[PDB]
Structure formats: structure tokens, C-alpha cells
Design a binder for this molecule. Structure first.
Ligand SMILES: [Ag+]
Ligand SMILES: [Mg+2]
Ligand SMILES: [Zn+2]
Lengths: 100, 244, 71, 127, 54, 100, 97, 236, 180, 49, 128
RNA sequence: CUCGA
DNA sequence: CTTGACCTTCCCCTTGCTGGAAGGTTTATAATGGGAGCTGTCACGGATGC
């Protein structure tokens, strides 16, 4: 929902847009037994398939100029262990709820 | 002066400054830009804006959150100005002048003991060895048991035999205060005559607990020593627990 | 009725009007006619004679111009 | 013609031209109403003379007077021939000593086959 | 000084700076700030030997 | 200059270096007390001026302490225990010790 | 936790706070009122200047105590002539007489 | 004045982007106005170019010059900002390419630099922390209450330095008349300053070598174990 | 001492406290950790960095008790004096102190007998104020607008004098008489 | 990666875990705070909440 | 044995011996309570081994490994013949460079009569 | 911010 | 007490450059009005403004 709300964003002059296809969560580089040792965040790299399209200038509705589709890395997200304990900088952290 | 707003390097190589070196740097920057703009013969819409910005940078230094929006740093926090350093519960007045942090002090968990008298209190050995350390040096140098202070500190670092028999001469007839926070009324700080027990808990007399309002369920009390010869007589004739 | 200085600055700059294509040519012609009076009015002074003396005596020992135009 | 375009015509480093301006070797160049060196073909001829003189074997001072013998229109070439013959005599004097190092180094590199022993016939002579 | 440490330090310091106000260190909250013997208790006997010879 | 973790320590006798090994880090399973040295680390000190009577003392005797200066890690006071685990991290391009 | 002397702070030159920081307990104004009420002015003059905040006061009292002569040696606190410099930087002339 | 006042929207159109938090928003506009006033006097109208073609360069130069000279507490020179920014652009590209954060050893391969140079450039940055920031999540414990003062002399190291002074004043009394004074002003003991060998030889008679012989005899007198037993324990 | 006095500070008093005018916004150097010349930390103005050493190191060792080095200008004293020496900044325009302006009551409109809502239209460069009017059609402190000043400039010539900014309020406080 | 790591690690709701029990670990996750962004504070909450 | 006659025993000078110590290539000479230096037969061999390298054989950077291998008891005959032969080959390449300078001045110095007539061809040609 | 009196 | 002979460290100096640091000056299609953050306290005293 957070991707589909923002994307697809277009150019300012209305000649291009970034289309969104899908995302994919890669494998964690380290396990939880050594993130508590080396002091690093137990996370998973987040990748996303983005599609950039170029619309023609003189054409009324011209999509056929080029289709650029590439996989983009953007940050990480910290995973959750099997009990609800995020591992941030080696120390196990718990996010409580909120009542608003 | 540049030692009341310092710029000190920490352990890891990152510096750590106070925030007056931002407001002062803004005043000096905009003042130099006004000196440059008055020699370029700039139009009036630029100079009238530059004088306004210089005035805003001056009163952002004298008292930050008063003119308009408060000036924020990089942390998205309002910078503490000169008037924010003398007011409130964090000024020089209410936190660093009326009440200070003192040397020759201690802190421990209190426990009840009924073998005492009304003017006595327990004290741990490992606490009175640390509170009365220069008195121990002055007694160890007088008896010739150590020829200098750098050879008298090693006799305390080893915890030898002769130290625990000098401590019983240093401690006797030397009162010591006992404060418990919050100190509501006048009886919230009293001076007792110490004894020496092993353990790690200040043993208090069971009758003074009505004055302290101290229940033995994990309370803590602070131990302050008087140093001089006038203050040691103001704890025996004015603040001893057999007088209150 | 405001205290944000950026609103004051934008309100003060808002009173003036943008320029067209020929307006910049008009103001450039004004600047050139302002400096040309100083150029054609300094020609009746001995400092202009000193400038002529130094500028030809510099090239005495000597678009990017041809040197024959300078001579 | 600034200092970087004359580095591509001759081949000197841009710092070396400022060095040759610091010491007394080349003609001083004019300035251009600002702090910028300008260069004419005379300085180009002096620098392409000095780079070739460095590459053939002259030092900085005999080239430093060779350039002054090139600048003046006289150049009575008797001392020119004298200095070139002194230079090739200096090359002879260097090459005879260097081949003497060769001859004295070949007579000791005859032995020492290179086994796993703990003695060497070369390490014992100079020690 | 006995008012500036209580409340509204800006108003108390501003009101007492355009008037040229002169403190005297009478009470026993200004002598705690300047690190001096308070004029009560055991300090009060000593304080008369300062007040009289002045 | 860089700091170093050495078994050599100035101004400290043999009575504290009994539990330090060849490389300067304490043995696994050695019973320690309050004040004993766990990791012997020395730091270089820039040269300072000297009071004149100490300058007389260091000409009466031949004691000349070097630019070395002890800032090692000690057990905090009132603590007994037993060293059950020692971990050593090192930067890239730095030669490791014998214990590491 | 107990502490005789060590690790004074940077700006204010009164000792630090925290057991892991090796700091002394805070003698807050709730106790300054309680020492004013007893009338013990000599214990109050000691717990403001010579124990905490002076610079030429502590290292003289230490020599007096090690020498065997308990004698108070007063002085103005260092936290007062930082207040003077921070009031004087507002363009408000404050002095003594 | 009219050409400067007319294009005062172009500078606030350019200074939207350089609000990266070194300077406030108004300082960028006030530097871009000085850039525009430089651009007015240089602009030639003969070449058939519009004014916004030319003045954008002189606005961007002034803003990007003031943001690198000002806006830093520990001021970095201008040529070091390029060496930092090349490293940060390459470290932005290596994260998209490889997917892992680049170590300096593989970063020097892209930068074509020695690795200690890259470790040197990655030390200059990280502008200082404010001493009023809270280090927990609190608001009563700032960072400025944890910084220990280190310049202070210790009260135990200022009590032994008086006992040593008294013991040195004691043990020099047994030295009679000449070796005491030359020993005191040879090491600067109880003098305004130290004297060299010839400046103290010129005081007694003339002699340079005799002063050194007196000094050696005085040190041989001090080292004999009947006076320096007290100064044994001042050593360590 | 036995009494603390407090009053306003003249510019001669602030120059009498000061030890040297600060001119540059630089704090320290980035390669070595040394204070820069005429900065916020400068060794010439506020004293030396270490005990009895100048910046360049030409003088040390307590022999030079109070000399000033000719290279770096640093007076050889203790580093304790960095907590007691002040400097000053010479402002290129007068500016209003915020304590004597926006406290309640205003304390600067209490003297001028003018509301704070009218003073803040002059401190911000929004409306002119008349210092004096030779022709008494324009009274004292009668606030003119931006466009009304153009009518008043052409109807009178230069018989009146109106200003805008903090120098207007400074010339208004300077040209009053307390004894009338 | 700045915003996500700011939330996981600097918020008022991403707090340290009490791990000195099996009980104290499990009742720290079923805890409904009412503070934080978009909520109350400890100086502006009366007897009614 | 101090630095008095060891400079004359080996053949060097005093400042040369101190610089050879400071470059980091011999054994640090032991000191005896005066800042003075002492010497043994090890240094009396090493200084001769490096001085004889400098006049005929080697340079200062290559003369470090020679004394680094001479004092070692586990030295072998493999790590000396390569290091002398490759720089004998370099010596002959310098001989060839000096021969290049030689015949580039020999072919240039010929056919140029230097007389009272100006505009000599060879010097104006080697300029450019 | 969480905890203790 | 004295004289010359030796030691120490430290600063300057020798070519033919090269590497680096710190500072200044331009660049011409056309670009012409920001955006982040606040709302869930209560009780006064007292300026202030028709
Ligand atoms: Ag020829
Ligand atoms: Mg309780
Ligand atoms: Zn100096």
C-alpha cells in the first residue's frame, strides 16, 4: 500500500513517469547469533523492480519510445525474530503498541 | 570567554561543542555580510533585509524563543541561548548555585539494627575507608608507618593490618550527617556517631524513623562528612540526634 | 501582522514586475548610455592623457585583436 | 598561451617551468593584467632547447649559460665547441668509472653457486 | 538576587537594570550564592563584627 | 603514534602481570579481583615540562621513564569473578597478535 | 558508593554525578533550607565553597587535612563568576564593590 | 537597480535546492543576491542571450561558495570538499551496484588512491555534537554533564609535590657553601629560571669545567646512602 | 566587597571590558587543532592555550613571565585566564536589545510613550517614524506609512526628517529630554 | 534507511527490553503505552485519562 | 670502543656513521650512561661491508639487505648472486645509456665548424 | 524514556 | 682549578625536481514566489485594544 499510494509519480512537464512493478526481500547477510556479537543490525535488504518509461514529445499519447526496467536497492528493513524482539545494534529491542 | 562555551574533543575523535558557537558565528557572518553589502552600493530591498536579518540573529542569541519562531539547530531542536542558561530548573541559579554536588559523600541501602543507642549509626567498612581517606593519610604519616603519601596510598590499596586499627582512631568522636531525600522538614538531616560493621548497608536506629519517614523497603540515605573543626562542633551541639 | 521574515521579504519583492525579452535590452541600453557619458566626458581631462600615455607605452615594448590594430 | 598549453608542446611538467623561472635559466614572461603567465615563441624555443639539453646530458648551470649563449645574437661558437667537448669528456670520465665498477663486480660474481649452505664466498670478502 | 533566583528572572533582571538597583546582601539566600556565612545561627555572632566595624 | 596492547607495562611489577599471557590479554578461567589488569594497553605520551626538584631527582638516580604511559583496563572495584570469554576484533590491514 | 575526590566537571568545576561516573551526591536546596534552619552556618559555608566549587579551596583543604590541621579556608565559588560573565554578556553591567 | 530588483525571483528559485542544513534559508538568498549583482555588471547583451542564461552561473557559484566557506564549525578548506564529495558519490554508487556497504580497501580500487589516503579523508568529517543534547531519551541529562575536566592537577599529586619541595629544601642544607648555590641554580631550584654551564661559570669565577666538577662531587655526595634515604620513596 | 551593583552598560564600558575585536567566524583548524587568528577562540585575544607557551613555541619555561611574542602576539600567561577575558563585536548597524524591548511592560515604549505595536512596525522595516518636524504638521513620533512618506517628502522638501530601523529608535531616545 | 533506522532505534516506543525473566520478557510485548507521537504527555494528563 | 677511530678503521666519517644508524640498517650501538656509543666486532664488520658496497658495489637501499643477511646464522648462497647479477646488468644498461649520450653527442658534434661565422647549425637544431 | 523511595 | 680534545643533539645546506596544501577566478540555450509543524492542560495576572 505504501508503494501503490505514492507511485506512479510522473515528471513535472508530463513527459515521463516511474511505474512500480513489485518488490522482493533478500536474504539476511548475517544470522541472529552473530548480530548480537559483532554489533550490527539484523536486517534484510529491500529491493524493488521499477519501470521508467519515456513518453514522446509530439505524440498525443505516445508510450513507445523506450521502456527502462531495472531493480533498485533502497535501504534495509530490520527483521523480527521469533518472539517480537528486533535486534538493533546488537541489543534486543521491543516496540510497544500505542493507544491513541 | 572561550572556556565557558568550550569546544572539547571527545574520546572517539568527534568534537563536542556548546551551542553559543553557532549563534555567535551567525552574528559574525551576517555582520560581515552587512559590511560587504554597504560597500557594493546595493539596492534598498537587499540592505533593508540584511539589517533585519542581523537584528534577528542578535536577538536569537540574547533570548531565543521570543521574537518569532525559535532558531533550530541540526537536531531539529531549539538552541539554548544566553537567557536560557539563567532561568528555570536548568539555569545557573536553581541547579548550580543554590544546590551543588559535594565531595566526601556516599550512598547506600538502609537497614534496621536495634542494638544501637540513640546517637549511633552503623557504617560499612568499605565506605568509611573511602570517606575518611585523607584523614587516614594524615594519621599514617604522623606515626611513621609510611614515609610519604605515594607510599601511604599503597597501604590502603593492599588493605593491610594496620589500616583497620588506624580507622578506629580516626572515626571515633567524629560525627557524620545522614540525609534522606526528600528532605521535607528540619529533622530530615541529622548527625550520628558512627560505628564500624561489616557488610554494605547503613544500619540506622529504629527510633529515628519517625523523623525521617523511612520504611525499610529499599530506601537509600546519603552520607555527608563534616571536615573542619567548626563544622564538627556544629554536628555535636546542634544536629546530634539526642538533641532533636 | 507577521513575524516570519521570509514572508516580509517575498511581500517586499512582490511589488515589482517581471521583465520581458525587450525589457532587458532596454535596461542594458540604459547601462551602456550611463557608462558612455563617463567615457565621452573623461576625454577633456589630463588623466585621460595619462591613460593614453601609459596604454601606448605599454604596447611600445610589445575577439582577441591583431597587434597591428593595437599599433 | 598559458602554462598548460606549453606543457603539451614541449613536454615539461607545469611545475618545472615555474622552477626554471625561479632559478636563473629562462626569459621571464609577461603578466596578463592578472596573475597569469603568458608565453610567446621565444620562451617556447628556450624551453624546447632546455628539455633537449636535459635529455642529452648537460646539467642545470652549463645549460644555464648555454641558454644565454643562445639568446644573444653573437654566439662565437669556439666556447660552444669547448663546452660540448668538455661535456663529452665528462661523459667519458663517467663511463670509464662505471665500466670500472662493472669489471670490479664481475670478478667476484664468479663463485657462489647458490646451494643451501651457511657459508658464502661473497659475504666473507667485504666483511 | 533573592528575587532573580525565584521566578521570572528576565523581568526581575530587566526591571533592576534600568533602575540602577543596588543590592546589599541582607538576607540569607544571597549569602548562599556568593559563598559566605549566612546571617543566622552561628554566622550571626560573627556578622555583627563585620556590621559594626563598617 | 598508535596505541598498543603489550604485556610490558611501566611502573607495575610482576604481581599484576602474573595472569597476563604472552600477548597481553588475560587467560580464560583466571580468577580476578578488584583492580587487577585484564588487558595491558599502553598509550604514547607527548613530552612535558618538569618541575625542577623532580629534575634533580632524575639526575641523582638514573630513572628516565619513557613516553609510554599506562592506561590499561582494570576490573572495577568490589568485584570478583572469572574470565569465561574473550573476543578480539581487529581492523583490516592490521597485523594480528598471537592470541587473536 | 562512596567518593572522596576525583573527576571534576569542565565548565562549572563542581564534581560529576553517577556511580559509574564516580560522582558525589547532590546537596540540593531542600537540604540547604534544612541547614539554614538548624543555624549551622559553618557546615553550609563548607558544603558550597571548599568541598565542591572552589579551585584554590580544595587543594588547600587537602593539604590542611593531610597535614593534620582542620581549618576552613574560604573563597568565592567558581559558579558565581561564571554567572557574572553570563550576565555581563547581555550588555548588563554587574560588578562588586 | 531595476535590473537587480526585477530578477529577484530567480535567486529564490535557485536557492530552493541548496537548503541542505548548513545555512538558514535567508542566508542563501542574501548570497545569491550578491551573485546576481556580480552577474549584472558582466552581462553582455550583444550575444543575443537572455539574462537567465548567464546569471544562473553567478548565483550558483556564490551560493556554493558561501556554503563551503561558512556553514561549518570546524572550517574545511574548499579543495577538501571535492575530495569528500567524490568519495561520497562513489560510495553512493557502490551501494546501488554491489548491494553491500563498501569497505575502504575496495573503495580505493574505484578511487584509484592509496588506502591510507581514503582512511585519512574519512576522519575529517562529522561536525560536532551539541553539548546540550540528551543522551538517553530524557530532557534533564544533557551531554555537557558527562565531560570530565582533564587539565586539573590531582590533589594527591599536588600534595606530594610540596613534600618533595620541602625534602629537597631539607637535604640541600648539609651541602655547605658553593655546591648548594650552584646545585640550586644549575637545576633552577628556587630560581626564576635555569642557568646554563657558562652563565653559572661566569658568576663564580670564570670557569666552565670547575662547575661541572663541583656538580659531579655534589651528586657523589648526594648518592651516598646517609642523606638520600628519604628520597628513595619519591622515585616511583 | 559588601554590595553588588547592576546597571546598564555603555559602549565605553563594553570596550573597557574587551581585549580585542573579533573579526572572523572561524573556530579552529582542521588538520592541527589550533585556534585561528581573530576567531572565536583566538589565542591573541583570550590568552594562551597551554601553560606558559605561545602558539609558535618561541617562548616557554616560566622564564618569560609576561612577555608578548612578536610572531603570534600571544601573551605568555596561564591558561586559566581563558575563563575571564572577553571580546567584542563591532556591529555595522545598531540593533535593539530584546530584553528592554519585548518584556512586559515594554520598557522602551514606556519611556517614549508609544505602543509596542507601533514600535515593532519601525524595528521591522515596515513604516517610517518622524524624529522631528520643523513644520508642525508632522508631530513627534507620528508614524507615516510607506507611500505617505512620498507625499510628505514632496509637500515639505527637507523640513522634516524621518527614518526607519533601529537607528530611528536610537535617534528618538537620543533626542529626548528627561528634565522637560 | 535514515527514516527506518530512526524509528527502529530512536523513538519513544522502541524501548529496551527487560530480559531478567521469562515473565518480564513476555509482559513487555503485551504493553499498551499511551505516550509517544500523536498522544499525551506526563505533564498534560489529568485525573480523567 | 666509541666513535673515535672506528671511522678510521672502516674508512667512513662520524656523521656518516650516525646517519647509517639513523637510517635503520645496522645494530643499534649500546650506550654507557653518558649518551656515548659502544662498538664491537659486529659493527666493525657491518660498516666495512656497507662502505665497500658504496664505493664500488651497491647503493644505500640495496646495502641494507646485505648486512641484514650477513649477521643471520641461517643465511644461504641463493639470495646474493641474483642481487649482484641483476644490478651488474643494470650497470651495463647504464653503460648503454651513457653510450647513447656518447654517440648522440658524437654524431651531433661532427660536421659543425665553430668559427667567427654565426648561425651554427647543430646548436640551433638541438634547440628546435 | 523505563525503573526504585 | 686549567686546556685542549673530543662527544651530544639540532638547524641549515647541497640538485632536479615532484608531491601536496591553501587560495582566487570563470562558465553565455533556458531556468523568475518555501514548507514543517502544530492540535489531549489549567490557572491565573496583567497588558491591550476598541
Ligand atoms: Ag653547433
Ligand atoms: Mg520506602
Ligand atoms: Zn609566540
Amino acid at each position: 500500500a505504501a508503494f501503490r499510494s505514492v507511485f506512479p509519480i510522473q515528471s513535472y512537464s508530463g513527459n515521463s513517469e516511474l511505474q512500480y512493478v513489485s518488490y522482493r526481500l533478500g536474504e539476511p547477510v548475517f544470522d541472529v547469533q552473530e548480530c548480537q556479537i559483532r554489533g550490527v543490525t539484523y536486517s534484510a535488504p529491500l529491493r524493488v523492480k521499477l519501470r521508467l518509461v519515456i513518453y514522446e514529445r509530439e505524440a498525443p499519447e505516445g508510450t513507445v519510445k523506450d521502456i527502462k526496467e531495472q531493480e533498485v536497492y533502497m535501504g534495509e528493513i530490520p527483521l523480527m525474530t521469533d518472539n517480537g524482539t528486533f535486534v538493533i545494534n546488537g541489543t534486543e529491542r521491543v516496540i510497544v503498541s500505542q493507544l491513541h | 570567554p572561550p572556556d565557558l562555551r568550550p569546544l572539547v574533543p571527545l574520546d572517539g575523535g568527534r568534537f563536542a561543542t556548546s551551542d553559543l558557537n553557532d549563534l555567535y558565528r551567525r552574528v559574525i557572518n551576517r555582520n560581515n555580510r552587512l559590511k560587504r553589502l554597504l560597500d557594493l552600493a546595493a539596492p534598498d530591498i537587499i540592505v533593508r533585509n540584511e539589517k533585519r536579518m542581523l537584528q534577528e540573529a542578535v536577538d536569537a542569541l540574547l533570548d531565543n524563543g521570543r521574537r518569532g519562531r525559535a532558531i533550530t539547530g541540526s537536531n531539529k531542536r531549539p538552541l539554548k541561548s544566553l537567557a536560557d542558561m539563567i532561568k528555570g530548573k536548568q539555569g545557573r541559579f536553581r541547579q548550580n548555585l543554590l544546590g551543588k554536588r559535594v565531595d566526601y559523600s556516599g550512598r547506600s541501602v538502609i537497614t534496621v539494627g536495634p542494638y544501637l543507642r540513640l546517637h549511633q549509626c552503623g557504617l560499612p567498612k568499605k565506605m568509611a575507608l573511602e570517606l575518611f581517606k585523607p584523614f587516614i593519610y594524615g594519621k599514617l604519616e604522623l606515626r611513621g608507618l609510611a614515609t610519604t603519601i605515594k607510599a601511604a596510598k599503597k597501604m590502603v590499596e593492599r588493605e593491610e593490618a594496620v589500616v583497620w586499627d588506624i580507622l578506629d582512631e580516626v572515626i571515633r568522636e567524629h560525627p557524620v550527617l545522614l540525609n534522606r531525600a526528600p528532605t521535607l522538614h528540619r529533622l530530615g538531616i541529622q548527625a550520628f556517631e558512627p560505628v564500624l560493621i561489616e557488610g554494605k548497608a547503613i544500619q540506622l536506629h529504629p527510633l529515628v524513623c519517625a523523623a525521617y519517614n523511612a520504611d525499610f523497603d529499599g530506601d537509600q540515605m546519603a552520607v555527608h562528612v563534616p571536615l573542619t573543626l567548626e563544622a564538627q562542633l556544629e554536628a555535636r551541639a546542634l544536629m546530634m540526634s539526642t538533641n532533636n | 501582522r507577521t513575524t516570519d521574515p521570509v514572508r516580509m521579504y517575498m511581500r517586499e519583492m512582490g511589488t515589482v514586475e517581471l521583465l520581458t525579452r525587450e525589457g532587458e535590452i532596454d535596461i542594458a541600453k540604459r547601462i551602456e548610455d550611463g557608462i558612455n557619458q563617463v567615457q565621452c566626458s573623461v576625454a577633456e581631462y589630463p588623466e585621460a592623457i595619462t591613460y593614453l600615455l601609459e596604454q601606448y607605452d605599454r604596447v611600445e615594448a610589445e575577439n582577441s585583436i591583431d597587434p597591428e590594430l593595437a599599433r | 598561451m598559458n602554462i598548460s598549453d606549453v606543457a603539451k608542446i614541449t613536454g615539461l611538467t607545469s611545475k618545472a617551468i615555474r622552477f626554471y623561472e625561479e632559478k636563473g635559466l629562462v626569459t621571464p614572461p609577461m603578466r596578463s593584467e592578472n596573475g597569469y603567465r603568458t608565453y610567446t615563441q621565444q620562451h617556447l624555443n628556450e624551453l624546447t632547447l632546455l628539455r633537449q639539453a636535459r635529455q642529452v646530458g648537460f646539467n642545470l648551470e652549463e645549460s644555464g649559460e648555454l641558454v644565454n649563449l643562445f639568446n644573444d645574437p653573437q654566439r662565437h661558437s669556439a666556447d660552444v665547441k669547448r663546452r660540448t667537448l668538455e661535456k663529452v669528456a665528462e661523459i667519458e670520465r663517467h663511463i670509464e668509472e662505471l665500466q670500472s665498477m662493472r669489471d670490479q663486480l664481475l670478478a667476484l660474481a664468479n663463485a657462489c653457486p647458490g646451494d643451501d649452505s651457511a657459508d658464502c664466498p661473497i659475504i666473507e670478502n667485504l666483511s | 538576587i533573592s528575587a532573580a533566583s525565584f521566578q521570572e528572572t528576565t523581568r526581575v533582571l530587566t526591571e533592576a537594570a534600568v533602575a540602577g538597583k543596588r543590592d546589599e546582601l541582607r538576607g540569607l539566600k544571597e549569602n548562599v550564592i556568593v559563598g559566605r556565612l549566612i546571617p543566622a545561627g552561628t554566622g550571626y555572632a560573627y556578622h555583627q563584627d563585620r556590621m559594626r566595624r563598617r | 603514534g598508535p596505541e598498543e596492547i603489550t604485556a610490558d607495562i611501566p611502573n607495575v611489577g610482576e604481581a599484576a602481570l602474573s595472569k597476563l599471557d604472552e600477548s597481553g590479554i588475560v587467560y580464560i578461567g583466571a580468577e580476578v579481583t578488584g583492580g587487577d589488569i585484564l588487558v595491558g594497553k599502553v598509550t604514547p605520551k607527548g613530552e612535558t615540562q618538569l618541575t625542577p626538584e623532580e629534575k634533580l631527582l632524575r639526575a641523582i638516580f638514573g630513572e628516565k621513564a619513557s613516553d609510554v604511559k599506562d592506561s590499561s583496563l582494570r576490573v572495577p572495584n568490589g568485584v570478583s569473578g572469572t574470565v569465561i570469554d574473550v573476543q578480539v576484533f581487529t581492523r583490516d590491514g592490521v597485523e594480528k597478535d598471537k592470541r587473536a | 558508593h562512596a567518593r572522596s575526590t576525583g573527576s571534576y566537571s569542565l565548565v562549572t568545576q563542581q564534581p560529576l554525578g553517577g556511580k559509574a561516573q564516580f560522582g558525589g551526591q547532590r546537596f540540593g536546596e531542600m537540604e540547604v533550607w534544612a541547614l539554614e534552619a538548624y543555624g549551622a552556618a559553618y557546615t553550609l559555608q563548607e558544603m558550597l565553597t571548599v568541598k565542591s566549587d572552589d579551585v584554590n579551596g580544595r587543594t588547600k583543604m587537602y593539604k590542611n587535612i593531610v597535614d593534620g590541621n582542620h581549618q576552613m579556608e574560604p573563597g568565592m565559588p567558581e559558579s558565581f563568576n561564571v554567572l557574572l560573565k553570563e550576565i555581563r554578556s547581555l550588555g548588563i553591567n554587574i560588578e562588586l564593590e | 537597480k531595476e535590473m537587480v530588483e526585477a530578477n529577484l525571483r530567480l535567486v529564490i528559485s535557485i536557492a530552493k535546492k541548496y537548503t541542505n542544513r548548513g545555512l538558514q534559508f535567508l542566508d542563501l538568498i542574501q548570497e545569491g543576491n550578491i551573485g546576481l549583482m556580480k552577474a549584472v555588471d558582466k552581462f553582455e547583451y550583444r550575444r543575443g542571450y537572455k539574462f537567465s542564461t548567464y546569471a544562473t552561473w553567478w548565483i550558483r557559484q556564490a551560493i556554493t561558495r558561501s556554503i563551503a566557506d561558512q556553514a561549518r564549525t570546524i572550517r574545511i578548506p574548499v579543495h577538501m570538499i571535492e575530495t569528500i564529495n567524490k568519495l561520497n558519490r562513489i560510495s553512493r554508487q557502490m551501494l546501488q551496484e554491489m548491494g553491500r556497504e563498501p569497505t575502504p580497501e575496495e573503495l580505493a580500487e574505484r578511487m584509484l588512491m592509496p588506502e591510507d589516503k581514503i582512511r585519512k579523508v574519512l576522519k575529517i568529517a562529522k561536525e560536532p555534537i551539541s553539548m546540550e543534547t540528551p543522551i538517553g531519551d530524557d530532557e534533564d541529562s544533557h551531554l555537557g554533564d558527562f565531560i570530565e575536566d582533564t587539565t586539573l592537577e590531582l590533589p594527591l599529586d599536588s600534595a606530594t609535590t610540596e613534600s618533595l619541595r620541602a625534602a629537597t629544601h631539607d637535604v640541600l642544607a648539609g651541602l655547605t657553601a658553593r655546591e648548594a648555590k650552584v646545585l640550586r641554580m644549575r637545576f633552577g631550584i628556587d630560581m626564576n629560571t635555569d642557568y646554563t654551564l657558562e652563565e653559572v661559570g661566569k658568576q663564580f669565577d670564570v670557569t666552565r669545567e670547575r662547575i661541572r666538577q663541583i656538580e659531579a662531587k655534589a651528586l657523589r655526595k648526594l648518592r651516598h646512602p646517609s642523606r638520600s634515604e628519604v628520597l628513595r620513596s619519591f622515585l616511583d | 566587597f559588601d554590595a553588588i551593583k547592576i546597571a546598564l552598560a555603555s559602549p565605553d564600558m563594553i570596550r573597557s571590558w574587551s581585549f580585542g575585536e573579533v573579526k572572523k567566524p572561524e573556530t579552529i583548524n582542521y588538520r592541527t587543532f589550533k585556534p585561528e587568528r581573530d576567531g572565536l577562540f583566538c589565542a591573541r585575544i583570550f590568552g594562551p592555550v597551554k601553560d606558559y607557551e605561545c602558539l609558535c613555541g618561541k617562548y616557554k619555561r616560566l622564564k618569560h613571565r609576561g612577555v608578548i611574542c612578536e610572531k603570534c602576539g600571544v601573551e605568555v600567561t596561564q591558561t586559566k585566564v581563558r575563563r575571564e577575558r572577553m571580546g567584542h563585536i563591532e556591529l555595522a548597524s545598531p540593533t535593539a536589545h530584546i530584553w528592554f524591548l519585548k518584556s512586559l511592560p515594554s520598557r522602551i515604549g514606556l519611556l517614549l510613550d508609544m505602543p509596542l505595536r507601533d514600535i515593532e512596525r519601525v524595528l521591522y522595516f515596515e513604516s517610517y517614524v518622524v524624529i522631528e518636524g520643523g513644520m508642525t504638521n508632522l508631530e513627534r513620533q507620528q508614524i507615516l506609512t510607506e507611500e505617505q512618506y512620498l507625499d510628505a517628502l514632496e509637500e515639505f522638501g527637507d523640513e522634516f526628517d524621518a527614518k526607519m530601523g533601529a537607528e530611528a529608535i536610537q535617534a528618538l531616545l537620543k533626542s529626548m529630554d528627561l528634565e522637560q | 534507511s535514515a527514516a527506518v533506522k530512526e524509528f527502529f532505534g530512536s523513538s519513544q516506543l522502541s524501548q529496551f527490553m527487560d530480559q531478567n525473566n521469562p515473565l518480564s520478557e513476555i509482559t513487555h510485548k503485551r504493553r499498551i503505552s499511551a505516550l509517544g507521537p500523536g498522544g499525551l504527555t506526563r505533564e498534560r494528563a489529568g485525573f480523567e485519562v
